[PDB]
Write a protein that binds this ligand. Structure first.
Ligand SMILES: *C(=O)[C@H](C[C@@H]1CCNC1=O)NC(=O)[C@H](CC1CCCCC1)NC(=O)c1cc2ccccc2[nH]1
Ligand SMILES: O=C[C@H](C[C@@H]1CCNC1=O)NC(=O)[C@H](CC1CCCCC1)NC(=O)c1cc2ccccc2[nH]1
Lengths: 304, 301
């Protein structure tokens, strides 16, 4: 099999990216049917970013203040409104490339693909996880705002993320497609701290299963443990609590490998207390936590 | 900025992927214009896998033995031929979604995106490098063959890889779109040893520049070294030799950081001799070698 950070194919999403300009600022927009979704901070001027009032700022705009370009074709804005931190720009043309889609809000620990965009043009795709502190470790440069994160279920594109800003620590913060920030962040250029991050334990375990599925077994041991005994050690290493739901989600991986979840927990416990001693798992010398159980299954099962 | 294993957006290639069925074997094809490209071992029976004579196998086939499906639309094969290890199926319909494309053969150390596909249907995109041993550390499962590796410049897709097989060590082998295998491998179910893989030094240095550009500088040192001095140490750690060309290719990154290439080499040499010692660079506890200088400049600019 082999194991790689694998994103969803980005084709269905590249067909929705447009460029949105308001005044001097240009950022990406998401064009679904006759609505373009973009960060509401496009309506902000540099003399306004420290504490904008977006209702004030949006009342002073007309439709002709928004230039929306789909490639070379300019879309005429017919209406606009604000839903939380996203601006919705109603345009006179529905997107012929609109895929089956939904807006979903993901949970910390969950992964998604990010189609990084500039001037409405897709430039790269990578896999991300919503960190426990509700930040993402993305790769974004100036102009990336409005790039979206998404998962694909068969033909359905589940948009879960729109990029708004970079925190001073260099991680990234954004909203779901309903404009609601992940985590306690606000769209103001103010001091904003991401809380302390933690390791997504269930994903480390999923990744350890993927290692066994792929023949890296050196870290396995004859020992088991209880959930509660494992979680006592997990807390010391800044690892998220492991719940019975996590154990139950790891079942299919447990079944394919014949290794009990609590047995894998005892292996992780020993990895944490002893380290890898310079050894590698799946080509990494640290415990990877940005693979969910479903990620592992799909890459080890061939889902299309 | 942030740093991530980033692949090219894959839509332009998704529009070219098809299912190719010959007998009992189903794998993926690349449909550009009126031609469908796929691995030739699609014509192999399980019995003929150990020692196939593809010229014999293809002579005994007709156009109607090749079932090409684009979505649920069946494509009619009008002609077939073999160019080395790839089969070229002429179909009666030119792909409407055909991008601007070229076929290119990449060098060791260069990277590309892989659109893993099953039954013609794109399932995932990831970044790869052509290792020095001409193998790729891929993620593929049964039905992956025909999956293509590619780079996108402007609107042009440069196809550089087509998936053919997994070596017993679990790395992967394949050909360019002209059917020439990368490395000394052949499409026969025989014992085939990939050579000793080595680390792509020029890419490790590029990634160390990415790291500096992203504020990770703990590994930097006041020391400098000559290319020949560095190479004496590189050899001992299974690292590729570094050339003045590599030095020159790393110029842009050296410029944007103000760190001389041979200064960064002095950092790498110390990282090799002492190790990271529990420290991390760009979220990695390993020196990463799958980012070319161009990858780094594109992601960091
Ligand atoms: C959108 O295109 C960019 C995305 C940033 C740019 C660089 N890397 C990214 O992820 N968004 C911004 O630049 C925001 C714009 C603000 C407008 C007003 C509402 C909040 C967002 N600014 C930042 O992301 C930003 C400014 C800043 C200053 C000092 C430290 C950190 C910091 N982050
Ligand atoms: O879809 C095509 C697959 C891709 C494989 C499948 C699993 N992971 C991959 O990358 N190719 C294959 O399955 C090809 C089949 C083809 C037949 C004719 C001669 C050339 C090879 N076979 C192989 O890769 C293979 C690996 C291997 C390891 C040990 C012993 C025999 C082996 N065979």
């Amino acid at each position: 099999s082999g194991f790689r950070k694998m994103a969803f194919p980005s084709g269905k999403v590249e067909g929705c990216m447009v460029q949105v300009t308001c005044g001097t600022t240009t950022l990406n927009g998401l064009w679904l049917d006759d609505v373009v979704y973009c960060p509401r901070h496009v309506i902000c001027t540099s003399e306004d970013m420290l504490n904008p009032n977006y209702e004030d700022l949006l009342i002073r705009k007309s439709n002709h203040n928004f230039l929306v370009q789909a490639g070379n074709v300019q879309l005429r804005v017919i209406g606009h409104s604000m839903q939380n931190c996203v601006l919705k720009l109603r345009v006179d043309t529905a997107n012929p490339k609109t895929p089956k889609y939904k807006f979903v809000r993901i949970q910390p620990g969950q992964t998604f693909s990010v189609l990084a965009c500039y001037n409405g043009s897709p430039s790269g795709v990578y896999q991300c996880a919503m960190r426990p502190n509700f930040t993402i470790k993305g790769s974004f440069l100036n102009g990336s705002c409005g790039s979206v994160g998404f998962n694909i279920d068969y033909d359905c594109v589940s948009f879960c993320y729109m990029h708004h800003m970079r925190l001073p620590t260099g991680v990234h913060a954004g909203t779901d497609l309903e404009g609601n920030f992940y985590g306690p962040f606000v769209d103001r250029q103010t001091a904003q701290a991401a809380g302390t991050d933690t390791t997504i334990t269930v994903n480390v375990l999923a990744w350890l299963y993927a290692a066994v599925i792929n023949g890296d077994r050196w870290f396995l041991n004859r020992f088991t443990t209880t959930l509660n005994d494992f979680n006592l050690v997990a807390m010391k290493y800044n690892y998220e609590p492991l719940t019975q739901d996590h154990v139950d989600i790891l079942g299919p991986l447990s079944a394919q490998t014949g290794i009990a979840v609590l047995d894998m927990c005892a292996s992780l416990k020993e990895l944490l207390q002893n380290g890898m001693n310079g050894r590698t798992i799946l080509g990494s010398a640290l415990l990877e936590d940005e693979f969910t159980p479903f990620d592992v299954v799909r890459q080890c099962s061939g889902v299309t």
